[PDB]
Design a protein around this nucleic acid. Structure first.
Length: 184
RNA sequence: AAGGACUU
């Protein structure tokens, strides 16, 4: 059980697969960034036709990071779409598979500043913007903000890490989804 | 296109 939990954080969803792509061609491509412990092309039960996506599982979260740092990836003559895998047990939550560049950061109360967030989050990727939300009339800080990156992957890594302490606060960090996006 | 045992 315990291993399985670990490897969930070492797994990439690979979508946009050529219908020619196999486990072997998938494994050949991703082995350039690490040692794979699993690799699967998901297929229709009846037809065995590729569902156009799969998973690869690496030996560490570092090897995942190295693979994602080397996008774009093309395999069997297609640029594919690699994404950190959402666990099956959370893949029915609203918004779970929605890919965004914006992060919601809550639980930061009144003392937390832009620079706190810039600081804490800059190590994860390139930040475009940072907004701390304040009341419209009173300008009282409402205790949350948003960080937008230039790429969705930082956001995926951040949220998957789950626990974050920011300016002495246990923050709630999630994707910042629109109402539309929340219907996915 | 979001997980293999659709493997009683």
């Amino acid at each position: 059980r315990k291993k399985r939990e670990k490897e969930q954080f070492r797994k990439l969803f690979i979508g946009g697969l050529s219908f020619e792509t196999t486990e072997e061609s998938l494994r050949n491509y991703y082995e350039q960034w690490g040692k794979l412990t699993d690799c699967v092309v998901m297929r229709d039960p009846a037809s065995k036709r590729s569902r156009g996506f799969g998973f690869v599982t690496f030996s560490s979260m570092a090897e995942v990071d190295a693979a994602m740092a080397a996008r774009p990836h093309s395999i069997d003559g297609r640029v594919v779409e690699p994404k950190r895998a959402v666990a099956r047990e959370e893949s029915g939550k609203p918004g779970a598979h929605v890919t965004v560049k914006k992060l919601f950061v809550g639980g930061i109360k009144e003392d937390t500043e832009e620079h706190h967030l810039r600081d804490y989050f800059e190590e994860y990727g390139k930040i475009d913007t940072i907004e701390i939300i304040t009341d419209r009339q009173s300008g009282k800080k409402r205790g949350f903000g948003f960080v937008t990156f230039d790429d969705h992957d930082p956001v995926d890594k951040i949220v998957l890490q789950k626990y974050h302490t920011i300016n002495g606060h246990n923050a709630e960090v999630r994707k910042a989804l629109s109402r539309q996006e929340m219907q996915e």
